[PDB]
Amino acid sequence: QVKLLESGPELVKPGASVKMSCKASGYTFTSYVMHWVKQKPGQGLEWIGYINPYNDGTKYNEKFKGKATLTSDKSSSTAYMELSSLTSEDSAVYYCVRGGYRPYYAMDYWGQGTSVTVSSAKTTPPSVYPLAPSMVTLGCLVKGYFPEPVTVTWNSGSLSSGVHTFPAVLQSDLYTLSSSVTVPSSTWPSETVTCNVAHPASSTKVDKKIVPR
């Protein structure tokens, strides 16, 4: 299978630079060009330019000219994009995409994408606070972490149905999010309920049990 493998998430300071990677396999790396696409959260897809790994030739979106540099290494089937003088407006998921091979090159293979957060704000774990009052709605509040994302489960995925885990909001240069779980009144608090919060940037895992007050 044709497969594109991108570099893990980045947290950079403004004014700095980042360089991401795209490992390509399952086809002749030199035979297809490699495009780069930018997507800010909740927003559209945006084309950057592409590298031709065969002759190292490049074509750029005017707007990203002198923001993004594209490169490739033949020997290791690898595509690279560097972004310089990083501003908050560079905070976005970035994709590498293989270019079709027709006739007319249609973009066909997308990688998982690489997330970049351009902030002076600094890695910070969250505080996890419980939320206790035929159904009961319990909660979990995830306050003051950075950067995104965090993952929430309840009872390590035992409780999948009836969960709402809301999008984080920037609370004074730090993120805040919450999560609700609805379960049968009879089951609680006899059966225990626990929110499992993970913040991979800080390698912190949290586990609040919801105690009835």
């Binding site: 559209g44 897809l45 997308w110 419980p130 939320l131 509040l141 709402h164 809301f166």
Partner: protein
Amino acid sequence: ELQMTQSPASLSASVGETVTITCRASENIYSYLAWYQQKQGKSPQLLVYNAKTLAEGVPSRFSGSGSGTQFSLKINSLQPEDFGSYYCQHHYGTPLTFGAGTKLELKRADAAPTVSIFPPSSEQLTSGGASVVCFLNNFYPKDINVKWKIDGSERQNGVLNSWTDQDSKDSTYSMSSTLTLTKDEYERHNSYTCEATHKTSTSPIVKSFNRNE
């Protein structure tokens, strides 16, 4: 540069229903247009290239058409899997410009929220802060207002709100509303009131608790 105008931005519809997405090029792009589908949290997927050829796997219900400057994507008899976002893109020449995107959402009947209010957690209190949380769960449509009231006087400062994406099982939305105060300001009052105003009723659904109970 080349300009692509995609319409509409958002569209709603029922399963079994047929919808059309339009894309306008500001210059003759002969027939070099592609369409993509992207679901929340996934990478985009090629649907149509060369303006009307389906990619492999793509259900027949999808159907591209057009030439020169006018293009449209028809999805016949929508299915649950079809809901998500669509993008057009010029694909043979630079710049491989994307449309702005169309978000496609599911219709259901108006639905009142299940509102829950939660008092600041004692653990948060020891940290000097106090967050009052209130969930307005599984409602339709997305428009809703929440009003916060402390001893019966409205409060706008320190209110953060977050809405989920459309629910994939029942098609409702859920909002979370957070009122943040300090332990002092908080300790200085009693009544904490969450009022939800929604086309589903004339009376706001009021949820409340008294700090001293």
